[PDB]
């Protein structure tokens, strides 16, 4: 039982820093000042933070927070086909004409 | 049988042990939480060394060695498991900051593996860490771990040898300063490793180092005593400027105030059009760590020294008068030398013009004149004379000159031209080199090579004019 | 103290077990990573996300565009 | 310790000032029989480790220079008392199924007292060339018990023939080095393939993470050069795991250092006599410590090998220390036909540089350095041993009282001459 409880003792430390995955670090950044990135001050956003951090609760259970993490994808895949499509078609038409009109 | 000490002091003597201690060592500088398990660590090593009967000296020099390799990035942790081990001098802890102490106190079992180890470099394999086992070293040498003198006078090149090639260089070079030597053209072109040694390890590097990270006071303490080691390589006076020009900026900038004009320093967005509209962007850079003192960027990226707290044990100067009393000490060291490094010639200048600037009006002008007279006498003339084809740093110091009468402007550079050309060996060495150049370019003045001749005519004689 | 050590055993097995417990957890922590990236790429390749409204988007985007929309396979990148 | 702390600072008034030196250590040898058990050991030696500069004067009754010591193996105070803690320490070590911690703790504090006791140089505080027996990590001889059974045996055979005695698989008769070296192939071939597969599952997350980073941005051109670990985003700022793994680190090691289980093995022991649990350890894929220690020992052992074949004096050293211990012995010391010296010169180079340095330096170019240096610095630490330890011999301490630099803090005058010179 000692061994045992030593072999996995380096197998977790080992899993922490050298063999993790993280996220895929896709960025925006929205105040006009900033014109360079550090590129490692990037963080995920607290309702993601939130979800990520709860997996590592002491009582909770890994499906329901895998369900969790399923609706916030589709949350956010909804929001953002939402706002596009609202965006580009009329937004697009409208500004066209106007600046027409405008330059006439 | 009766008086060994039966322990295994040579790695392939007793192989599991090592074994165990070094993978073991691996793994601390691969665990995130291992500042917080130090403790755990120690007891862990100090199980293995008994179980196995390892040796103190051996197990200690296995220590520095894998430590050294990822120094860089561990450090923090490197210098807390040696502070809480017992292998680390705790009732007579050295100081290496204060010139009565800088031969008492450490722990001279260190000093000694450690004085062995920064002389071996004759194999091929340890010519590529040297530097990373000097950076350690100089790490520990700050923390009070050693001594330094413990370990000054016990590294390679004794100091007869150093004295020796110094007289060399000293006369070769005043050889061929005053005698001069002719550059082959076209001569005879148709008819019809001690001194790398010296240069590259040993004393020398390790004052370099001991220069980079911000511990002044032992090579201050050097060079106090030996100056002529300057002729031996140009970085020490680079260095040397590099902590100054660190210690003044902040009195700079609270004069001659830039500090209103520094939100200037931004780059541009990064603009493209996308679906028929503009749309901009930041730039997207990533931060490296090396061993290189000065910062730079290589078109993607940028770099920084990784030992972010250097300059601990440094404190910039509040006021003017702290400015002369600390020059005479930094500046009288570097020398003729300070014209290596023209941006201090620009700096001190500025800080003169702007502090002559500030009272105009009042009544003790005269007083604030005289001083600056004396120094700039005594400090930055005779650097400003060192320049090379170097126009706009003799611009300054001449834009801070305008302010003296006349009188004093020519005793000045008659003192210059009589009493310090000869009888000091850098100055001497280039008033020869330009006259010598001078002469060679005006053989050659033409109605046809006006041209170029009249620019490079005019950046030497606005170089180094007298 | 060798003689006896049935007596000591259970405690250490109870760390043994929960240091597992966590490890798993950790696993997990990775592998819902692992879909999330994925899903991003999704995202980035063209336009993909050919989902049904069901009277959502109606809520959502708004009833007046809704019409030239009857008349979703949307780029999202 | 009051008593013992008195019989120093009476010395002055002793009629032989000098006779204090064989009291003083004398009484400290009687309180060290008289400890009831390690645990008493232990919380008492931080006095003896207090005042380690007052046994360090034999005779004079004026401190010492710090890092310079007067006591020899044979003189008058260590006569006795070194042969008797060499008894101790002799015992402590025979015991080697019934150790506690505590007397491996003991052990050590009681060998790095007597080897700062003694100078460096000491012609007793450096072995003379003793490789060491009995390097057993098998969990003495409790839980001592296919694939499994063959690996086992292999590892077996091989580490014993050729790591426990580097000398005799050294001299052989050109059948036992064949045959370690056809017991040890397929070994070195499995460990390889599995470390392999390690470094590939690394790479492949690396690199499958970077593309996409890239592709995600507008002009991000990532650096594919690097790949030092670094800890993820959501980790390296977070607050409740960092309290949750510290409350978890914390519970461990208070069931470690705990009177209740102080017989447990090492962290990092493997227990050849076990074949399945040294199975479990060597082929995981995700712990690879065992394999780096595997490694290591073959590199020093090929090491010391390829040394005495080839150098032609380091054996003649060897062979006198064999000797002179016994008269009576049977390698040949003398015998290397060219047969033999080369099936051996040729193994280790084979395995010491062929495969394994070539291997680790594509991948993984920190473990790289490390097993190079450690080789290089033993062959430097052989070689000064061989001279005996003269290289340490010579120091140098400084005596001299420094003092506050002055620093000229005055400009020069002005002479009369208003302008330069005389005639202006």
Request: charged fraction near 25%; include cysteine.
């Given at each position: 039982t000692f061994e045992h409880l030593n072999r996995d003792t380096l197998r977790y430390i080992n899993l922490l820093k050298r063999l993790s995955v993280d996220l895929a670090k896709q960025v925006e950044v929205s105040d006009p000042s900033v014109t360079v990135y550090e590129m490692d001050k990037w963080v995920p956003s607290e309702k993601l933070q939130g979800i990520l951090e709860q997996y590592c609760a002491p009582d909770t259970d890994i499906r329901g927070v895998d369900a969790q993490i399923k609706n916030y994808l589709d949350q956010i895949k909804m929001a953002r086909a939402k706002f596009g499509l609202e965006n580009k078609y009329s937004l697009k038409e409208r500004l066209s004409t106007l600046t027409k009109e405008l330059n006439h | 049988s009766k008086y060994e000490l039966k322990k295994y002091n040579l790695l392939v003597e007793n192989s599991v042990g090592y074994g165990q201690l070094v993978a073991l060592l691996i793994l601390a500088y691969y665990d995130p939480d291992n500042f917080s398990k130090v403790s755990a660590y120690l007891k862990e090593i100090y199980h293995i060394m008994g179980k196995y009967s390892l040796d103190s000296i051996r197990t200690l020099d296995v220590i520095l060695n894998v430590s050294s390799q990822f120094i860089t990035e561990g450090y923090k942790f490197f210098i807390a498991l040696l502070r809480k081990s017992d292998s680390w001098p705790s009732s007579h802890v050295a100081n290496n900051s204060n010139y009565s102490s800088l031969n008492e106190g450490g722990n001279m079992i260190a000093a000694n593996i450690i004085s062995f180890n920064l002389s071996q470099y004759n194999e091929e394999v340890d010519k590529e860490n040297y530097e990373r086992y000097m950076d350690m070293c100089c790490i520990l040498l700050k923390n009070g771990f050693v001594n330094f003198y413990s370990i000054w006078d016990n590294v390679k090149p004794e100091m007869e040898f150093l004295q020796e090639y110094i007289q060399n260089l000293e006369t070769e070079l005043?050889?061929?300063?005053?005698?001069?030597?002719?550059?082959?053209?076209?001569?005879?072109?148709?008819?019809?490793?001690?001194?790398?040694?010296?240069?590259?390890?040993?004393?020398?590097?390790?004052?370099?180092?001991?220069?980079?990270?911000?511990?002044?006071?032992?090579?201050?303490?050097?060079?106090?005593?030996?100056?002529?080691?300057?002729?031996?390589?140009?970085?020490?006076?680079?260095?040397?400027?590099?902590?100054?020009?660190?210690?003044?900026?902040?009195?700079?900038?609270?004069?001659?105030?830039?500090?209103?004009?520094?939100?200037?320093?931004?780059?541009?967005?990064?603009?493209?059009?996308?679906?028929?509209?503009?749309?901009?962007?930041?730039?997207?850079?990533?931060?490296?760590?090396?061993?290189?003192?000065?910062?730079?960027?290589?078109?993607?990226?940028?770099?920084?020294?990784?030992?972010?707290?250097?300059?601990?044990?440094?404190?910039?100067?509040?006021?003017?008068?702290?400015?002369?009393?600390?020059?005479?000490?930094?500046?009288?060291?570097?020398?003729?030398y300070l014209g290596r490094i023209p941006t201090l010639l620009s700096k001190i200048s500025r800080i003169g013009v702007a502090d002559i600037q500030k009272n105009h009006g009042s009544e003790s002008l005269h007083v604030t004149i005289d001083k600056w007279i004396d120094y700039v006498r005594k400090f930055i003339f005779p650097a400003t004379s060192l320049l090379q084809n170097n126009p706009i740093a003799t611009s300054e110091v001449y834009e801070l000159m305008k302010f003296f009468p006349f009188e004093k402007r020519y005793f000045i550079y008659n003192e210059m031209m009589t009493k310090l050309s000869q009888d000091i060996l850098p100055l001497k060495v280039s008033f020869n080199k330009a006259e010598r150049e001078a002469k060679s370019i005006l053989k050659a003045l033409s109605i046809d090579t006006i041209a170029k001749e009249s620019r490079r005519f005019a950046k030497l004689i606005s170089t180094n004019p007298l | 103290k060798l003689e006896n050590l049935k007596d000591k055993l259970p405690d250490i097995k109870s760390i043994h077990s929960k240091l597992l417990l966590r490890i798993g957890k950790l696993q997990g922590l990775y592998d819902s990573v692992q879909v999330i990236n994925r899903e991003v790429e999704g995202l980035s390749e063209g336009r993909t996300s050919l989902v049904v409204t069901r009277a959502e988007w109606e809520k959502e985007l708004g009833t007046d565009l809704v019409k030239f929309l009857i008349e979703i396979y949307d780029d999202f990148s | 310790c009051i008593g013992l702390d008195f019989v120093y600072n009476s010395r002055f008034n002793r009629s032989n000032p000098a006779s204090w030196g064989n009291t003083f250590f004398?009484?400290?040898?009687?309180?060290?029989?008289?400890?009831?058990?390690?645990?008493?050991?232990?919380?008492?030696?931080?006095?003896?480790?207090?005042?380690?500069?007052?046994?360090?004067?034999?005779?004079?009754?004026?401190?010492?220079?710090?890092?310079?010591?007067?006591?020899?193996?044979?003189?008058?105070?260590?006569?006795?008392?070194?042969?008797?803690?060499?008894?101790?320490?002799?015992?402590?070590?025979?015991?080697?199924?019934?150790?506690?911690?505590?007397?491996?703790?003991?052990?050590?504090?009681?060998?790095?007292?007597?080897?700062?006791?003694?100078?460096?140089?000491?012609?007793?505080?450096?072995?003379?060339?003793?490789?060491?027996?009995?390097?057993?990590?098998?969990?003495?001889?409790?839980?001592?018990?296919?694939?499994?059974?063959?690996?086992?045996?292999?590892?077996?055979?091989?580490?014993?023939?050729?790591?426990?005695?580097?000398?005799?698989?050294?001299?052989?008769?050109?059948?036992?080095?064949?045959?370690?070296?056809?017991?040890?192939?397929?070994?070195?071939?499995?460990?390889?393939?599995?470390?392999?597969?390690?470094?590939?599952?690394?790479?492949?997350?690396?690199?499958?993470?970077?593309?996409?980073?890239?592709?995600?941005?507008?002009?991000?051109?990532?650096?594919?050069?690097?790949?030092?670990?670094?800890?993820?985003?959501?980790?390296?700022?977070?607050?409740?795991?960092?309290?949750?793994?510290?409350?978890?680190?914390?519970?461990?090691?208070?069931?470690?250092?705990?009177?209740?289980?102080?017989?447990?093995?090492?962290?990092?022991?493997?227990?050849?006599?076990?074949?399945?649990?040294?199975?479990?350890?060597?082929?995981?894929?995700?712990?690879?410590?065992?394999?780096?220690?595997?490694?290591?020992?073959?590199?020093?052992?090929?090491?010391?090998?390829?040394?005495?074949?080839?150098?032609?004096?380091?054996?003649?050293?060897?062979?006198?220390?064999?000797?002179?211990?016994?008269?009576?012995?049977?390698?040949?010391?003398?015998?290397?036909?060219?047969?033999?010296?080369?099936?051996?010169?040729?193994?280790?180079?084979?395995?010491?540089?062929?495969?394994?340095?070539?291997?680790?330096?594509?991948?993984?170019?920190?473990?790289?350095?490390?097993?190079?240096?450690?080789?290089?610095?033993?062959?430097?630490?052989?070689?000064?041993?061989?001279?005996?330890?003269?290289?340490?011999?010579?120091?140098?301490?400084?005596?001299?009282?420094?003092?506050?630099?002055?620093?000229?803090?005055?400009?020069?005058?002005?002479?009369?001459?208003?302008?330069?010179?005389?005639?202006?």
């Open positions: - | 005043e050889e061929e300063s005053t005698k001069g030597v002719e550059n082959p053209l076209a001569m005879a072109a148709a008819l019809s490793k001690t001194q790398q040694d010296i240069l590259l390890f040993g004393k020398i590097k390790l004052l370099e180092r001991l220069l980079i990270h911000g511990c002044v006071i032992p090579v201050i303490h050097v060079l106090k005593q030996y100056p002529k080691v300057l002729y031996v390589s140009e970085s020490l006076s680079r260095y040397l400027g590099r902590v100054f020009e660190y210690l003044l900026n902040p009195l700079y900038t609270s004069m001659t105030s830039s500090g209103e004009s520094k939100d200037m320093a931004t780059a541009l967005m990064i603009t493209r059009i996308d679906n028929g509209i503009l749309a901009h962007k930041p730039r997207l850079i990533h931060k490296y760590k090396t061993h290189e003192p000065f910062e730079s960027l290589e078109l993607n990226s940028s770099y920084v020294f990784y030992y972010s707290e250097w300059n601990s044990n440094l404190t910039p100067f509040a006021s003017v008068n702290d400015l002369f009393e600390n020059s005479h000490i930094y500046l009288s060291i570097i020398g003729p | - | 004398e009484l400290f040898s009687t309180i060290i029989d008289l400890l009831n058990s390690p645990s008493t050991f232990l919380k008492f030696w931080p006095y003896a480790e207090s005042r380690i500069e007052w046994f360090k004067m034999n005779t004079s009754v004026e401190p010492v220079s710090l890092g310079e010591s007067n006591l020899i193996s044979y003189k008058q105070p260590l006569y006795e008392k070194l042969r008797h803690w060499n008894d101790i320490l002799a015992k402590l070590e025979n015991n080697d199924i019934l150790n506690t911690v505590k007397h491996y703790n003991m052990k050590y504090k009681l060998e790095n007292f007597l080897s700062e006791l003694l100078p460096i140089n000491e012609e007793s505080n450096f072995n003379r060339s003793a490789s060491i027996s009995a390097l057993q990590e098998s969990d003495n001889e409790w839980n001592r018990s296919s694939s499994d059974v063959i690996f086992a045996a292999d590892y077996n055979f091989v580490f014993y023939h050729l790591i426990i005695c580097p000398i005799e698989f050294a001299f052989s008769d050109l059948e036992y080095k064949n045959d370690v070296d056809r017991s040890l192939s397929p070994l070195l071939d499995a460990i390889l393939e599995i470390e392999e597969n390690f470094y590939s599952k690394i790479k492949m997350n690396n690199r499958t993470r970077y593309s996409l980073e890239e592709a995600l941005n507008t002009e991000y051109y990532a650096n594919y050069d690097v790949m030092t670990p670094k800890l993820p985003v959501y980790m390296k700022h977070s607050n409740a795991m960092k309290m949750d793994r510290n409350e978890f680190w914390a519970n461990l090691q208070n069931i470690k250092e705990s009177d209740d289980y102080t017989l447990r093995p090492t962290i990092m022991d493997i227990s050849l006599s076990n074949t399945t649990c040294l199975y479990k350890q060597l082929t995981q894929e995700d712990d690879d410590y065992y394999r780096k220690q595997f490694i290591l020992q073959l590199c020093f052992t090929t090491n010391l090998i390829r040394n005495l074949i080839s150098s032609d004096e380091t054996r003649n050293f060897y062979k006198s220390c064999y000797l002179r211990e016994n008269p009576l012995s049977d390698i040949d010391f003398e015998n290397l036909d060219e047969v033999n010296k080369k099936r051996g010169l040729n193994l280790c180079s084979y395995i010491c540089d062929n495969r394994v340095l070539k291997f680790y330096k594509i991948k993984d170019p920190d473990f790289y350095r490390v097993i190079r240096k450690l080789m290089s610095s033993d062959e430097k630490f052989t070689t000064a041993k061989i001279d005996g330890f003269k290289e340490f011999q010579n120091f140098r301490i400084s005596k001299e009282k420094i003092p506050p630099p002055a620093f000229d803090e005055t400009f020069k005058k002005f002479t009369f001459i208003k302008m330069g010179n005389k005639l202006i």
